[PDB]
Design a protein around this ligand. Structure first.
Ligand SMILES: [Mg+2]
Lengths: 49, 82
């Protein structure tokens, strides 16, 4: 939503001017973060961990 | 000693309030000489009242010569957009 404002001082009998709430957005574009690893089956066997 | 008309007592007098309110609802302009007795101007200190015709209902009421639609007698400061 747009910011708050102040009411206008107005003459007697004079009509009300409009200043409505305006709107906008912020978009999200979720970016795929990725991470990877490869181990040989010989290493996977022989490691103590 | 203070009398009702004395300058320090005027704000205590109910009539000074009531009659200044009357004066504001009577007027069409700030020209007091055009509208009020010189007694009233002094007695009710009408120079100091914000008399300008903005408080008179007749300033805002419609009163056209011919009325086919019942528009007359509406007060503009009572419309939807006021
Ligand atoms: Mg605005």
């Amino acid at each position: 939503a747009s910011d708050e404002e102040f009411a206008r001082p107005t003459g007697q009998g004079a009509e009300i001017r409009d200043d409505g709430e305006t709107y906008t957005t912020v978009a999200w574009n979720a970016t795929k973060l990725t991470e990877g690893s490869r181990v040989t089956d010989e290493m996977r066997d022989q490691a103590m961990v | 000693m203070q009398l009702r008309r004395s300058p320090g007592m005027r704000p205590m007098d109910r009539d000074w309030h009531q009659e200044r309110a009357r004066a504001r609802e009577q007027a069409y302009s700030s020209d007091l000489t055009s509208q009020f007795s010189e007694s009233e101007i002094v007695k009710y200190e009408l120079d100091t009242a914000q008399i300008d015709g903005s408080d008179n209902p007749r300033t805002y009421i419609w009163n056209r010569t011919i009325d086919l639609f019942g528009m007359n007698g509406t007060d503009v400061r009572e419309l939807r957009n006021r």
